[PDB]
Amino acid sequence: KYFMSSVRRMPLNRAKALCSELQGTVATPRNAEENRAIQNVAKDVAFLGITDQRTENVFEDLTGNRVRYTNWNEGEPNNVGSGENCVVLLTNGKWNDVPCSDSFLVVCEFS
Amino acid sequence: KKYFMSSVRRMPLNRAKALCSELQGTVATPRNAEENRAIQNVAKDVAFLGITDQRTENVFEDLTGNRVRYTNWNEGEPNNVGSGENCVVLLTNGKWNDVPCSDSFLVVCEFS
Ligand SMILES: CO[C@@H]1O[C@@H](C)[C@@H](O)[C@@H](O)[C@@H]1O
Ligand SMILES: CO[C@@H]1O[C@@H](C)[C@@H](O)[C@@H](O)[C@@H]1O
Ligand SMILES: [Ca+2]
Ligand SMILES: [Ca+2]
Ligand SMILES: [Ca+2]
Ligand SMILES: [Ca+2]
Ligand SMILES: [Cl-]
């Protein structure tokens, strides 16, 4: 896998469109090594290709595959307010669930 | 190493540049036959290369203004037809054709 970060921030729908445009997908770390690699390419908080939009508290990648490895920041995922169904990788590498409509950088993953 | 990825949609060169730069890459510029073939492998149809003679006609440079060395022009190219063709695309046979920068084609981005 090759990981590339965007320079501008955008909501998940636009982030998915960007990675998909170059025939990739929003980055989904499958282990601690991939998590670090994505963290490194991301210069700020960035979206990951994981959501619980289909079933609340059931996190899966953008292709419907349930994720096994997770790295939630303490207290996460908390689905606060009216709900947080998207996921971002914080600058310390831990994850936070956030509203999919919010804007963050995006890290795309290619094979 | 250099990695190449092709777009799904077609767009003019300035948009192609913006797409590749969005992910901190550039429009693919083959420096030799191996790279030319690597780009061929990812481009399913005619696609833009990061080369233009916009500065001086018939002097081809990459997008950073660096004069290119390796070229693989299709027979009869570059012909600068009509009002001008100052951008370059990789044809489906791997050879190059100069085309109007305002025309739309797939784009192959390069990252390293
Ligand atoms: C208290 O909730 C935390 O802080 C909020 C400002 C949001 O970033 C939320 O995702 C996070 O879990
Ligand atoms: C005759 O010129 C050739 O055919 C035209 C349709 C254009 O594609 C032009 O770039 C090419 O050199
Ligand atoms: Ca949720
Ligand atoms: Ca949260
Ligand atoms: Ca020309
Ligand atoms: Ca031509
Ligand atoms: Cl949400």
From Swiss-Prot, chain A:
Top-level division of the source organism's lineage: Eukaryota
Disulfide feature: 19-108, 86-100
Localization per record: Secreted
Annotated C-type lectin domain residues: 1-109
Domain remarks in the Swiss-Prot or TrEMBL record: The coiled-coil domain mediates trimerization.
Subunit structure: Oligomeric complex of 3 or more homotrimers. Interacts with MASP1 and MASP2. Interacts with MEP1A and MEP1B and may inhibit their catalytic activity.
Function according to Swiss-Prot or TrEMBL: Calcium-dependent lectin involved in innate immune defense. Binds mannose, fucose and N-acetylglucosamine on different microorganisms and activates the lectin complement pathway. Binds to late apoptotic cells, as well as to apoptotic blebs and to necrotic cells, but not to early apoptotic cells, facilitating their uptake by macrophages.
Protein name listed in UniProt: Mannose-binding protein C
Organism expressing this protein natively: Rattus norvegicus (Rat)
Shown segment, full-protein numbering: 133 to 243 of 244
